[PDB]
Ligand binder design. Structure first.
Ligand SMILES: *P(=O)(O)OCC(C)(C)[C@@H](O)C(=O)NCCC(=O)NCCS
Lengths: 134, 98, 72, 212, 50, 135, 72
């Protein structure tokens, strides 16, 4: 356990995620009958502003197949929330043309390094080549 | 269509989709399939939707005599029935007048 | 494995049944693959195993058994 | 959201249950009345919201069933919340005879309008007169008093079937009637070309017919 | 009955024609570009070998 | 114009964009009154199966703020949709740590080329070393 | 449409048994705690539902509920 978990924050995250999924059409609840599903969704909607009861709501009506996805989404949300405080711990997202990405991933898989490590090593070698020439 | 180029094919597909949007609004799952068929990464989806359309018109057949489940085949039987009903309508209106 | 990756490639590049594609099943007569179809089949076989084949030695391949023989 | 029909009931089922025709149809159905093509309004109502009503009535442990002939009715289960009852053997005789008349072309001139006398004549023609009479009275041997008793019993069974929708009395005449397709149920034991003794077990298993 | 049958016939006709129009166009396109790409690829392969 | 503009597709894209924005809570309408805004949104909702009228609904009730974001988003969506046909024209999204990205962006701004071009030059120098090692 | 609270009362899992017993003429008193509470809560709507049948849902002064059929 590296990042401390805060209930009033992660519960709001879970509520927002479930509301987003419901608005997207995902079946939040395990009830195939539409009446029970709608009733549970209404309970959730009126359940806003409550961690201790949204957790119970999840335990009681949550769709079995979404547990893993919700858990990993909350994991990622927690990690990003804690890393977004400092500049050096943040992550920069870019888009690479498919050939360039293909070659870079080929190198990374070949050497066992990650994309960041592979690019760092390559840049260091480029600098070393510059110094060699210079 | 083999002669034409990609631009005209794309344009006429867009026009066909425009017609479909009106022709499909009533249905829910068929409309959803039509919407999903729009992804360019999975052209096969298109064909699937086409199947659904057939898989729809098959169930719209009314009675046994029109069970030429090939939808393009039922058109002729239905036109025959419309013509027939026209004659009965003429006879019936004459009867009502008398 | 290679001996079943070959079937995976042949069936999904010619559309014929897995049962149809036996070791001795010739492409043109059994599987029905014509000039361009066989060209695409050999291209896919090249791509699967990330290798290259000579033109003449490739065109010499005209059967599942020959295909595997050159692949393995 | 709250105060929203979908919370408790599907929209179409609620619309069906709020329609002006629902109460008469429900009372008749629970009473045991079969619905045929003749009751155009009620038949169309059942057709439009057929699925909602089967699932609603399932809550009573009774199946709203549409026979292939196109007539709806209710079949209670062993765990029915609505009581259940079985027709008399004489009722079976009259129903089978009624199905025959529906399918019989000799009486085509009648154009579907039949009198109880003709029904009794046909019944005695096809059934065993005295051995059928045995059920009317255990000590019958062809006495005309018992003959009139059997005629009266047939008339009473015909009235009960009228209550069940198998037969309609004419808008002004209670001595003449018109048959309905519901009578086809009396032939459910023979609609399938198999051994009678296996079809009877199938039906009784399905709850269609109990024995006596 | 006439109205219902005419509506059914019109709906069937329109749906079928529009679906065929929507699908066959892109199908023929994909076929044409597939042929063109194969033709392009052969020359590259030939040059590469030597 | 490099990408063919399709009306019945861009109209659907625009309608979906408007609906998504509204359900996110933003004021797509130009109306400050609640009733007129609600009516305009309801009409837009009715316009689901008629993308052609969506252009007119835009010209009548779309918030003046959104023209730039609208014209940006649909343009980008068109580019991506047409590039998605072939792999070699697609784009791949990757995430980089701040130090690594800082160095890479500084290098790219030094060489005056895009990130992909800088990576191409870098990987090409590495592959040149590998090639001369191989020969 | 239908009244919302009427839909809630009809949908309640107690409704089938209670409806059958009412249509059978049974009187629901204070002893039947669940049924009596249900009728107390949802009387305002069950009265209309059973008036659609030309019947009156009557709560006696003693408290028990019952159905009184009209001429129609
Ligand atoms: P199919 O009857 O369409 O035949 C196709 C083909 C065998 C002619 C074709 O795939 C092909 O091989 N073309 C190139 C032939 C060649 O060897 N050219 C030299 C290199 S460009």
């Amino acid at each position: 356990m590296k990042y401390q978990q805060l209930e009033n924050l992660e519960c709001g995250w879970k509520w927002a995620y479930l509301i987003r999924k419901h608005q997207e059409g995902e079946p939040i609840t395990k009830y195939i009958e539409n009446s029970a599903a709608h009733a549970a969704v209404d309970k959730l909607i009126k359940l806003e502003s409550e961690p201790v009861r949204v957790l119970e709501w999840i335990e009681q009506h949550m769709n079995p197949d979404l547990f893993n996805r919700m858990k990993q989404t909350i994991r990622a949300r927690r990690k990003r929330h804690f890393n977004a405080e400092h500049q050096h711990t943040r992550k920069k997202s870019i888009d690479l043309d498919f050939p360039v990405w293909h070659r870079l991933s080929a190198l990374s898989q070949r050497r066992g390094n990650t994309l960041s490590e592979t690019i760092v090593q390559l840049i260091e070698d480029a600098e070393r080549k510059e110094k060699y020439a210079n | 269509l083999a002669y034409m180029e990609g631009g005209a094919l794309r344009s006429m597909s867009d026009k066909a989709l425009g017609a479909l949007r009106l022709a499909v609004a009533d249905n829910e799952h068929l409309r959803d399939a039509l919407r999903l068929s729009e992804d360019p990464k999975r052209p096969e989806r298109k064909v699937q939707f086409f199947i659904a359309v057939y898989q729809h018109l098959r169930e719209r057949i009314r009675q046994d005599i029109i069970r030429t489940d090939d939808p393009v085949d039922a058109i002729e039987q239905m036109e025959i029935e419309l013509a027939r009903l026209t004659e009965e309508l003429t006879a019936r209106e004459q009867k009502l007048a008398i | 494995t290679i001996e079943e990756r070959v079937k995976k490639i042949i069936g999904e590049q010619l559309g014929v049944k897995q049962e149809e594609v036996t070791n001795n099943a010739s492409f043109v007569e059994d599987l029905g693959a014509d000039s361009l179809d066989t060209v695409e089949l050999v291209m896919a076989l090249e791509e699967e195993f990330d290798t290259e084949i000579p033109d003449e030695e490739a065109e010499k391949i005209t059967t599942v058994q020959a295909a595997i023989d050159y692949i393995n | 959201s709250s105060t929203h029909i979908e919370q408790f009931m599907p929209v179409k089922l609620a619309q069906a249950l709020a329609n002006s025709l629902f109460p008469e149809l429900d009372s008749q159905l629970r009473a045991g009345r079969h619905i045929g093509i003749d009751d155009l309004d009620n038949h169309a109502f059942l057709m439009d919201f057929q699925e909602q009503l089967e699932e609603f009535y399932a809550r009573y442990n009774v199946e709203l069933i549409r026979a292939p002939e196109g007539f709806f009715y209710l079949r209670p289960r062993s765990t029915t919340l609505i009581p259940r009852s079985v027709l008399s053997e004489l009722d079976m005789m009259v129903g089978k005879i009624l199905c025959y008349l529906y399918l019989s072309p000799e009486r085509l001139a009648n154009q579907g309008i039949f009198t109880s006398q003709e029904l009794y004549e046909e019944l005695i023609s096809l059934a065993d007169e005295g051995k059928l009479m045995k059920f009317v009275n255990q000590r019958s041997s062809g006495s005309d008093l018992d003959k009139q008793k059997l005629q009266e019993k047939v008339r009473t069974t015909l009235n009960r079937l009228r209550r069940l929708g198998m037969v309609y009395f004419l808008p002004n005449n209670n001595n003449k009637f018109t048959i309905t397709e519901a009578v086809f149920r009396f032939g459910a034991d023979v609609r399938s070309g198999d051994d009678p003794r296996e079809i009877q077990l199938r039906m009784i298993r399905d709850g269609e017919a109990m024995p006596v | 009955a006439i109205r219902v049958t005419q509506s059914d016939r019109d709906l069937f006709k329109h749906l079928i024609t529009e679906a065929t129009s929507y699908v066959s166009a892109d199908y023929m396109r994909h076929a044409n570009e597939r042929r063109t790409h194969l033709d392009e690829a052969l020359a590259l392969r030939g040059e590469l070998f030597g």
